[PDB]
Design a protein around this nucleic acid. Structure first.
Lengths: 78, 80, 199, 123
RNA sequence: UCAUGGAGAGUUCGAUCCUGGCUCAGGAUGAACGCUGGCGGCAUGCUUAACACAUGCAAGUCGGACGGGAAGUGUUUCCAGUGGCGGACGGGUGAGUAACGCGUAAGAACCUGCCCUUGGGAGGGGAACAACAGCUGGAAACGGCUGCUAAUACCCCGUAGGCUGAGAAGCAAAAGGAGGAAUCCGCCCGAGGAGGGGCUCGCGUCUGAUUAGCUAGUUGGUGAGGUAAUAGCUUACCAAGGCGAUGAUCAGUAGCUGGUCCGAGAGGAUGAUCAGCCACACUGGGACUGAGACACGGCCCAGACUCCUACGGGAGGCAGCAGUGGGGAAUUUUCCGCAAUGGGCGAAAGCCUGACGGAGCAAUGCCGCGUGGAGGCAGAAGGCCCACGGGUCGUGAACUUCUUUUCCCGGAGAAGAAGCAAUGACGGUAUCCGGGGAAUAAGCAUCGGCUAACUCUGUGCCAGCAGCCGCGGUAAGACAGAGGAUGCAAGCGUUAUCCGGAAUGAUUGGGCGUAAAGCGUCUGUAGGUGGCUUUUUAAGUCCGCCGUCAAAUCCCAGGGCUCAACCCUGGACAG
């Protein structure tokens, strides 16, 4: 499927980043496009992500309870 | 494995049977990957769909008794 | 049921029900009171188009709801298609061929199993005929000439264009579904259709 | 109520069709035990002596139910079968009592509309 | 062309317009009660107490794995026991579970007996444990020493495209049986596949802020362990994280979905039978074996409860099918059969299946059919009403003929059953033929407006009716009766629950001067919306193609039951 690109929130954990993922969604009964945020824990053995950078989440083998993704880099076609 | 078997599909005193290749652990009226065949024992046709029965028998889903007997009426059996 | 009942009441109330239950016009010695004086609610008018239809074919009203649901369910003029699903009713055809004088006469004439259709017997008056059918007597009916009595007294009115009566071999067939002009009874389809809008 | 955010919070919801019989709370009609068989008067425009049985039910409530028809057999501690339906004239009477059912006889000598009163055919 | 869909009425007031609420007309029930009740076809049949349960049955099988013994007199049938699979499927219920449990859609870290394909192997030894014989304990349930025995049962050595490890090195298996043979069923080690499972994740998944903080194996990291496999799965230490005003945590409710019902539509309510997934099996908690359970009819323990006891102890789990008792308004027979279908075992023969196939009762529902057809002087008998002339019951009946769906009395008589024959609970059922005979068969609501149907007698604010308005104090089209009429029809009504109507929670579709409603006004955070031109990516958007959304249902078109209901075959828009 797709990746889930999104900003890094706070990386005060080794090999671990929280990521806000912003997702538009049609609200069911009323027809707008409401955003919903959902933040994840991603893995990086390199841990080369500061606060505020934005990554892409890809499914991998689960590392902990929450850490079920590792994020590498977006493509960046502007 | 899968066991190609009939299932009763009709009213009371009717016996319109499908030939379904479901897993043998299921109840007799369950769900199939592909419901291949038909058998109407009162008097009507029997659509068979030969390539799919050759797919499953080529895989190795053995049939039951009278499904095998329907398969012995027609010349379905080729070992390829 | 059948309603099996007093029927000049229904002819005085609904107006003259054509052919059904009489060729004799109503009130040969009657009607000498009961001024209507012109007050009739519109619901009474639409209700009298229900029962002008329901008694003229002898239907159960629940079965008439059934025919309206099929008539909506088909594509086209539901005011006409209701009078196609109630013309190709079998005992209406045996009435219309003159195989019986009245429609209870035809309904009873098909209850006691006197009609072969395409060589097979049909025991049920609500059978809906098709184009290109075959409607005959029973083999005993060349010895039981009740049908020939009805065909004797009948032929004032001829036939509408679906029928083809063969004289001695007693076979009647319908070429195609009956046209609205073809329908014998005179009534407004819209009045009846509007009435069932409520359900 | 804009389409944006006063209404993808919520509009509001209407409550229910509020129950027009707080007892009978499973389903339609329920066995009863007679406690009082007294008689009360309606509101001001009418004038009658309407005869109601205050009745304990098998549900867990106690409720004053009306007794239809003309004659009534209902003494103390008999068994009835109450049903819903609001008698307007009486404040508090919410329910009826079925006649012709268990331990509440049919009405005396009625030949018009008997299925509402539990009287078998004459003739 | 598309369109197959949208109805109003009553009630505030002396009247009028309006807001607004209530009530009705329409469908649907797993329904209940009342009155009435001919048949047939197909469905449905504890919604409540996941409440106890009498009795029988619901899971066996294999002697072609093995040893014994027990009927029959070389020959066969059985059998408790050790083994082999099956008891994890099928059946039942929805208590819990607001959660990857479910639905849908992806993924990698796994397992997998029976089932197909495929590469190789089965030498050698050995010890017992049941059974059994003896003694003996117990009322039973069960045992306990003493010896003995066999194997596809156990153990050891060698050998292995496997495993461990960086390599070095090591480590690991087998079973025979049937047959004269032929061969077949097996066994052990690998390698795939199908199907079945175990996990993980995106999204969807009820209300309540008069519940605002929660969480310390908690959220991460490493090391050690552990699991079939990843993992705080577990443990020691380190880091302080993680969730939340877009509702965390708590409380309450609820099995979920294909679907059902309604609605014009958007969608609202709901999850019976049919089908898929989950959970439970008296209430709790454990583990064992196997491929697979923390196992409904397995084991062990605790708790409560019932039965037996000879008083020491035992035995038990109907939310399996029938059934009893209780609760309830209310939900059936302690039935027949493995003939089919589907399971399990077996080489086969066959065996066992309360799954399933049928039958019985119940108008519980949907559909079909009958209670007569045609004529009937317009003359009589009668009820009710009448300006006493008559009218109306009424072609209705009486009466004359025709017919026999059904009814009775007889005959015949299926397929369903599968090419070796035989093999049917249903059942002499379905269906057909013959002989009488209109014979055996119509009720229930309503008649003041909505709402079709109305006059008369009795009652006199009484008895009563009533869905809302309201009728009822002497001539009541509203109560009670009769006549008549109306609508329905083997049904008719009332009630309850749900949707409609209801634009009365409003996206389609409402409002806020005075009718219910603008915060007292202002600053501003989060958040929402946003000027113009040019360029870029395409997340939204649109188009093509592809995958999937099980089957059943709904829609179209065919086909089958004499039609319909129902069943079946094929197809597909939506989304």
């Amino acid at each position: 499927m797709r990746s889930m690109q999104g900003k890094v929130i706070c990386a005060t954990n080794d090999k671990t980043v929280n990521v806000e993922v912003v997702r538009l969604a049609p609200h069911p009964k009323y027809k707008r496009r409401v955003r919903k945020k959902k933040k994840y824990q991603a893995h990086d053995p390199d841990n080369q992500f500061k606060v505020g950078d934005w990554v892409q989440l890809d499914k991998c083998r689960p590392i902990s309870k929450t850490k079920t993704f590792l994020a590498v880099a977006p493509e960046g076609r502007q | 494995m899968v066991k190609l078997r009939l299932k009763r599909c009709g009213r009371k005193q009717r016996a319109v049977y499908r030939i379904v290749a479901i897993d043998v652990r299921s109840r007799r009226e369950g769900r199939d990957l592909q419901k291949v065949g038909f058998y109407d024992p009162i008097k009507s046709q029997t659509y068979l769909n030969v390539p799919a029965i050759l797919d499953f028998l080529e895989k190795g889903a053995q049939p039951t008794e009278t499904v095998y007997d329907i398969l012995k009426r027609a010349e379905v059996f080729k070992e390829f | 049921s059948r309603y099996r009942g007093p029927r000049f009441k229904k002819i005085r109330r609904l107006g003259a029900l054509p052919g059904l239950t009489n060729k004799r016009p109503r009130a040969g010695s009657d009607l000498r009171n009961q001024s209507r004086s012109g007050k009739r609610s519109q619901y009474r008018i639409r209700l009298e188009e229900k029962q002008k239809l329901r008694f003229h074919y002898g239907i159960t009203e629940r079965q008439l709801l059934k025919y309206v649901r099929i008539a909506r369910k088909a594509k086209g003029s539901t005011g006409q298609v209701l009078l196609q699903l109630l013309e190709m009713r079998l005992d209406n055809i045996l009435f219309r061929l003159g195989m019986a004088p009245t429609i209870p006469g035809a309904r009873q004439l098909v209850n006691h199993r006197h009609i072969l259709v395409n060589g097979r017997i049909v025991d049920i008056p609500s059978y809906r005929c098709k184009p290109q059918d075959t409607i005959m007597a029973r083999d005993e009916q060349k010895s039981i000439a009740l049908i020939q009595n009805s065909l004797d007294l009948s032929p004032r009115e001829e036939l509408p264009k679906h029928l083809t009566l063969n004289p001695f071999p007693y076979k009647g067939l319908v070429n195609q579904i009956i046209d609205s002009k073809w329908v014998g009874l005179k009534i407004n389809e819209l009045l009846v259709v509007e009435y069932y809008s409520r359900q | 109520m804009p389409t944006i955010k006063q209404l993808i919070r919520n509009t509001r919801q209407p409550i229910r069709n509020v129950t027009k019989s707080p007892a009978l709370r499973g389903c339609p009609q329920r066995r009863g035990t007679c406690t009082r068989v007294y008689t009360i008067t309606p509101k001001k425009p009418n004038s009658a002596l309407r005869k109601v049985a205050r009745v304990r039910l098998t549900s867990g409530f106690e409720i004053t139910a009306y007794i239809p028809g003309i004659g009534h057999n209902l003494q103390e501690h008999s068994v009835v079968l109450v049903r819903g339906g609001r008698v307007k004239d009486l404040p508090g009477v919410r329910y009826h009592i079925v006649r012709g059912t268990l331990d509440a006889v049919g009405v005396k000598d009625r030949q018009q509309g008997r299925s509402k009163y539990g009287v078998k055919k004459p003739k």
